[PDB]
């Protein structure tokens, strides 16, 4: 039944060079849609020619295409291991500048109550790139979001807010926020995270006055920076 379809699709897969060949894939589309797991495909390949050689807006175009056949069609692993390559392959080429808006795109298409680690990881690694941004409002909505997912990833979240609050230069507040982490961090893995939060938690005791705990607490942040590894060693 779906014969034809892969053999097309498999055919404009080579060709090399990007000429004549997206048209091919959009004549892959262009087969009337009924699986359609082979359009998502071809918008894909599309997708991984685009953003590396030449224009962008098109790009923009043809991943809200994409954008469709994450609930129905094709399922919703093989789309979240789609997107995610596709998201590292513009990450390492590209910077924020074009990134931040897929990034916002993805996330006002996966409007959906299933999606657990698909929302958020992309709205944490959208709130890393709105504090490289320098963008302290929009990013208190995105952090408001990710504690109301809970309310292993709230220490993440924690994490997020004290990195925030530290560009803020808010104190009180980030003694807070590490004394509420400080419970979290009974039964959780072992990331770089326990590490980050502890080094705040250094300098807030070197504020109050308490230099022993502020000892202590360097002193584990470091071990975590040097299982992790520098800028933040060596000030540690």
């Given at each position: 039944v779906d014969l034809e379809n892969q053999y097309y699709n498999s055919k404009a897969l080579k060709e090399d060079d990007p000429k004549a060949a997206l048209s091919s894939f959009q004549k892959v589309l262009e087969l009337e849609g009924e699986k359609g797991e082979w359009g998502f495909k071809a918008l894909k390949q599309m997708i991984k020619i685009n953003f590396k050689l030449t224009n962008f807006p098109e790009m923009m175009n043809r991943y809200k295409q994409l954008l469709t056949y994450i609930r129905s069609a094709v399922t919703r692993n093989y789309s979240e291991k789609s997107i995610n390559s596709i998201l590292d392959y513009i990450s390492t080429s590209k910077q924020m500048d074009l990134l931040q808006e897929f990034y916002e795109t993805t996330l006002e298409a996966?409007?959906?109550?299933?999606?657990d680690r698909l929302w958020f990881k992309t709205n944490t690694k959208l709130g890393k790139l709105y504090l490289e941004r320098e963008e302290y409002g929009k990013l208190q909505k995105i952090l408001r979001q990710l504690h109301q997912s809970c309310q292993t990833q709230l220490l993440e979240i924690y994490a997020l807010e004290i990195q925030m609050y530290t560009a803020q230069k808010n104190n009180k507040k980030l003694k807070a926020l590490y004394e509420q982490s400080l419970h979290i961090k009974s039964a959780i893995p072992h990331p770089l995270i326990m590490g980050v939060i502890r080094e705040c938690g250094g300098k807030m005791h070197l504020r109050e006055g308490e230099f022993e705990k502020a000892h202590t607490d360097f002193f584990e942040a470091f071990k975590n920076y040097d299982e992790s590894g520098s800028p933040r060693r060596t000030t540690c």
């Open positions: 996966l409007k959906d109550a299933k999606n």
